[PDB]
Amino acid sequence: QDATVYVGGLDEKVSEPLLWELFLQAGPVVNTHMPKDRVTGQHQGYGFVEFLSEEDADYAIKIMNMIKLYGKPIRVNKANIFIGNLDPEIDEKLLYDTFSAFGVILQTPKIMRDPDTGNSKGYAFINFASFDASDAAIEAMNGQYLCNRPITVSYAFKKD
């Protein structure tokens, strides 16, 4: 897990030897793994590249971070408001700093991860201090231009 780098944000043009060919300049990528879905039978955008040394994986994570690969925000990492279609290049501290401009955050946010890879699932949950920050996130942040990924902010629970 230390020598392997988890890549997120892969489109349909990216393939299993294509990621190994793109990561060959960063370091000696020994193997590439792409988990296939059960309903569609294709990649879900997240994969893994197992290299030989941890320094090559660190250089690939520091070089290929927030890159625009196949029209997709590909990024390598070390393997009541709901935000969907978020970029995997952002972290919890980056999401807390991005959410601090609209309103005040009550605590540190959390992002959902896949049970197989564990880098990024695609959705996240963040809680605001009051309902005014949630309304400002649903008015402004729900549709704002993020890092090559159109996010969507919505309410997790609402009572009619």
């Binding site: 009051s130 309902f131 005014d132 309304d135």
Partner: protein, 123 residues
């Protein structure tokens, strides 16, 4: 982080003995080729340096132990218990004020989510 904290404590001790706002022992040190990034207010350590300077100024008070001796806080446990009870009452009043502010914010959010947003009038 011990050397930076010691430098901040030395700057707070040297700045508290000044007779003016700008005529201090640290303003002339900035022009004497001494790098001090904690003097600018843009850094996060400046908020702690200001609290250290405030504590150094409060350590120079006449009831702080320079020319007088405290008798109520040092020789009366009942006065300390009354001060602790007053601090607990002030904390309870602050918690009640925060709960009232949260209730007012919830009432404003309930009133804003129930008003009609289709009756537009441009005058």
């Amino acid at each position: 982080s011990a050397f930076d904290l010691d430098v901040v404590k030395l700057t707070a001790q040297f700045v508290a003995r000044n007779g003016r706002q700008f005529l201090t022992q640290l303003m002339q040190k900035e022009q004497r080729n001494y790098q001090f990034d904690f003097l600018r207010p843009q850094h996060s350590l400046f908020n702690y340096f200001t609290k250290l300077v405030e504590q150094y100024t409060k350590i120079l008070i006449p009831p702080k132990g320079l020319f007088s001796k405290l008798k109520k806080e040092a020789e009366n446990p009942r006065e300390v218990l009354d001060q602790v009870c007053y601090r607990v009452e002030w904390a309870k009043f602050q918690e009640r004020e925060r709960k009232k502010e949260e209730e007012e914010k919830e009432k404003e959010r309930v009133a804003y989510a129930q008003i009609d947003w289709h009756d537009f009038v441009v005058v």
